Amino acid sequence: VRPKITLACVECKERNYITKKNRRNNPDRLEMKKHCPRCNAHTAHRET
Amino acid sequence: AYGVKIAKGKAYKGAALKRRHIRIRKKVSGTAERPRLVVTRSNRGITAQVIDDIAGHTVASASTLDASIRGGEGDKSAKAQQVGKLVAERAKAAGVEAVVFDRGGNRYAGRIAALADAAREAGLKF
Amino acid sequence: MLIPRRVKHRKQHHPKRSGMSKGGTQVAFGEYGIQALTPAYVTNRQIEAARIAMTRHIKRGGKVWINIYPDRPLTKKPAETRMGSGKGSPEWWVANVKPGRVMFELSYPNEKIAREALTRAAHKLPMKCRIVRREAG
Amino acid sequence: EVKITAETRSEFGKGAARRIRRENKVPGVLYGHGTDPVHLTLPGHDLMMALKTSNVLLSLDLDGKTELAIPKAVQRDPLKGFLEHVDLLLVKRGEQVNVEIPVVTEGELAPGGNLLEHVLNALPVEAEATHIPESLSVSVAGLEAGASVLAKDIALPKGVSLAVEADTVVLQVLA
Amino acid sequence: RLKITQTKSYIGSKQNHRDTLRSLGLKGINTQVVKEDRPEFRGMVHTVRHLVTVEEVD
Amino acid sequence: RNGRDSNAQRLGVKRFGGQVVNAGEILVRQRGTHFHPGAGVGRGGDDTLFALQAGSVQFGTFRGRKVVNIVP
RNA sequence: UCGGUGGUCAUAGCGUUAGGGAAACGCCCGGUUACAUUCCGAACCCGGAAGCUAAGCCUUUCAGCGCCGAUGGUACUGCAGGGGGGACCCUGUGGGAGAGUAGGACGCCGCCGA
RNA sequence: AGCUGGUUCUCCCCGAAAUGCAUUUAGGUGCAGCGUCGUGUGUUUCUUGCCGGAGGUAGAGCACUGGAUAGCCAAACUCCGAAUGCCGGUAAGUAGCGCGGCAGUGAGACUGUGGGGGAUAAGCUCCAUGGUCGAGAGGGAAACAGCCCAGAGCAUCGACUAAGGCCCCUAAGCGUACGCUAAGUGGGAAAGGAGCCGACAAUGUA
RNA sequence: UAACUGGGGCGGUUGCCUCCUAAAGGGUAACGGAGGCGCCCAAAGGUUCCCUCAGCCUGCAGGUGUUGAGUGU
Fold first, then answer.
1. In whole angstroms, what is the distance from residue F51 CA to residue F42 CA?
2. Is some CB atom of chain F closer than 8 A to the CB atom of B32?
3. Is C85 helix (H, G, I), strand (E, B) or coil?
4. How far is CA D33 from CA D37, D69, D89, in A?
5. How far apart are CA A28 and CA A23, in angstroms?
6. Rounded to the nearest 5°, which phi and psi values hold at D35?
């Protein structure tokens, strides 16, 4: 029910973080902002 | 300290402010390097003292009872500017550079912002 | 027959029996009382048998108080069962009576009949008992 | 007033007291009126004969000094009944103290299955330390079931007043 | 000063009782040691009061 | 249906009064705040009390609540 | 002699009884803007000073409820022994409560400002 | 063969274990605990006094939860709360630790105390904390591994004692003085009844 | 073609968390006494600011109420 998602921003195209998120609660592809170590910036990581 | 009780009708202003003051004093203590900078906000004027809670003594102090402010032109907001300036001076004198501001329970706006800014431009680091 | 209508834990340890009574050593309600002299467990059956003895003997008038209540559960496993495999189900309800405890109380106009009724009860109990009169504090 | 000879206790603790009772003496302590407690040893037999009476006035022949005292609290063996400890309270001639007096009921209840319950074994009253009545007498004759006698229903002797609220029940009659 | 004589065997006594006797210097039945009257030694005697006899000597 | 238990956690006080400690040592392991952090004492993620500065451990009552304290 | 800020955390509290306005604190009257109300300038925020100690606050009486509380003893107990058919009971030496009693208590200790 | 049996000369020094975790594991084994030897350290070990600490057991109590006719009850109730024990400091008094070689042990028993299961059973069973046996000779309890006294290098035709005893068997008292027992109690037992009764199984006193 | 097991089989259990037994540090057994877990929340996380409940009494409002409510489980 709660699968493991892999976050990714639009620049580094490197899979940084993974997390749990209830599918039925958040069907829309989840998104937030993290610290990408390649980019060295606080960019936005759209769920893969 | 250990908080105070609640109140009913009258004395609710006093209790709520005091209860709020305790909330602020569970993370703001008067050290030796940076003392406390309590600021009481009454109806007439606004006082501000520099207390050392670890020792218990007070280092500096200023209010509207001093001659410099006692009687003059300006509303309260501009009247706190004098109080801010002196206490900064009376703190610089007795070897104080960095202090920890506390609201006293009342919100940070109006005079409390104005008093802080007047004290902050005089050298003290908040 | 006295049973607790509700008890938090059905299965309990054996109530220890060292020491004297915490309290209830003196006549409180009635004029005469039964004071224990040795420890024992008094089952709800034993209390009932004693109560009938006193009330039947006096036959009318007089009032009997039962100061102890059998609320401690004792357990017993099914017969001819080997050791182990859990604890048994409660069977007897016992009041942990220690030396000095005043168990039964009785008020009656006639002293001789009172003592006789009290003695008849004592022989239904499993400990040594003594008859005590209410001290005029 | 009862004259009793009393000696001073110097050894304290579990072992000392057990030896004292083994010698058939009752340890005691005399206190009151802001004085330092005086630790006493008492003759066991003379004590029990004296203490048969409630609130008996004792004149302690203490080391050639006579002092007035009243037994305030006494510890007895719960099973054997011999005295173990006495607390003696100082009282001077003519001062008021609060004491408990037993109530003795006079007369015979009205005929029937009526029973008398002593809700309070002893009635608390304040009385002069030297003129404490031995007991308070109550007339219960003719009473029926449900009838309850209040504290204010007790006919006190002159000089005695209640130390409890006037509405407290002392006696009751049960079916 | 205290003159301490051991009168009973250490066999059957607790381990700390054995060490108390050793610390006092006692090493068997009928052995003696002389110590100063100090709170430590009064305490050691009390711990093994059933295994030793103490005599006061100037 | 009995016979289940959770293996022991070894909670309790790990440094007692008068005990000299170095900064960061564990003073108390506990569930909830039976002891609150005092001067020079920090609270961990799981209520653990650890010294922030070297000193001697000392218990007390600050502001009406039992606390641990480190005295340099 | 009062206002601000601390420590102990009821021996301080609660209730009850008589009062106080010199500065101070507060009530207090208004919403123009900044600011705010799950709706209301009641609260926060803003600007003053008409009236007032009625309440808050401070002082004060009462041991009434609550609170604190010895000494002595007892239970209990480390060590060492006894007794009993058993459940268990007792003592020597060291330690020693809880309850209860006599009593205490209508707080105390700092720093500033008027 | 995780199994059974056997393994041969002597003396000197030290000297255990039957416990914890895990285990296709339970009568086996790995690691840790406990032994010994070498090497480095040197009082660091241990005992007692004092000092600084946290507690929630025994006891007690009803202020919370529950039971229950003003009096009461409670492993999973606590307004309270020791004695001990534990951690650290220090003083006095007399083994500890690091690094390596080599092990055995991991079937425990009874007795004192605090408990659980059992039925207010068991020479029962499972724990905690002492003692002895195990691996301990010698003296006592008639005999009687685990109880009381006591730790055997060897010799001794000397002495004093411990537990336990002192009429004869059998070493030492027909001891001195006061009092109790009439039942051979001593030399087994209950509720209960007025030292006694209650008292009662099988080879032969027993 | 498992083990535990008051012989073995039958029945039951096997990992983790909380309480009591557990003898006031820690640890401590039994096929001892009670229960839960194999998740959930994109906020039920972070921070800043603000508020105090349950219950009771009176006719949403008022008085009382310091923890007896709540704390995802």
1. 6
2. no
3. coil
4. 10, 12, 9
5. 8
6. -85, 155
CA C82 from chain center: how many Å? 33
What is the stated resolution of the deposited model, in angstroms? Answer: 3.1
Residue type, B123: G
| Cα–Cα distance measured from residue B120 to residue D108, given in angstroms and rounded to the nearest whole number | 94
Q: Name the DSSP letter for residue A36.
A: B
Residue D11: partners with Cβ closer than 8 Å, 6 or more residues away:
D19
| Exposed / middle / buried, residue A12 (Cβ in 10 Å: 0-12, 13-18, 19+) | middle
Tabulate helix, strand, coil % of chain B (nearest 5).
35, 15, 50
Q: How far is the CA of F64 from the C1' of H66 (A)?
A: 32
Residues of chain B found within 8 Å of residue F65, distances taken between Cβ atoms: 2
Distances in whole angstroms, Cα of residue D30 to Cα of each of D94, D126, E31: 19, 20, 51
Residue F52: CB partners within 8 Å, gap ≥ 6? F23, F24, F40, F41, F42, F70
Q: Which residues of F touch B2 (CB under 8 A)?
A: 63-65
Task: Quote the strand ranges of C20-135, DSSP E.
Answer: 32-36, 40-43, 63-66, 72-76, 89-97, 102-107, 129-133
In degrees and rounded to multiples of 5, residue C39 shows phi and psi of -70, 155
With a CB cutoff of 8 Å and minimum separation 6, the contacts of E18 are E10
- Phi first, then psi: give them for residue C120, nearest 5 degrees: -60, -35
Instruction: Please report, for chain D, how many H helices and E strands are present, in that order.
Output: 2, 13
Nearest to B3 by CA among B111, C85, F13, B21: B21
H192 closest protein residue (CA to C1'): C123
Distance CA D25, CA D37 (A): 19
Q: What dihedral angle (degrees, nearest 10) is formed by the CA atoms of B68, B72, B73, B76?
A: 70
Q: Which chains touch D (3 or more CB pairs under 8 A)?
A: C
CB D133 within 8 A of CB D111: no
F41 CB neighbour count, 10 Å cutoff: 22
Candidates D52, D164, D53; CA nearest to D119 is D164
Q: What method did the depositors use to determine the structure?
A: cryo-EM
Cα–Cα dist F70/F21, whole Å: 9
The answer for B 1-20 residues in CB contact with F (under 8 A) is 1-2
Interatomic CA distance for residues C116 and F49, integer angstroms = 69
Q: How many residues does chain B have?
A: 126
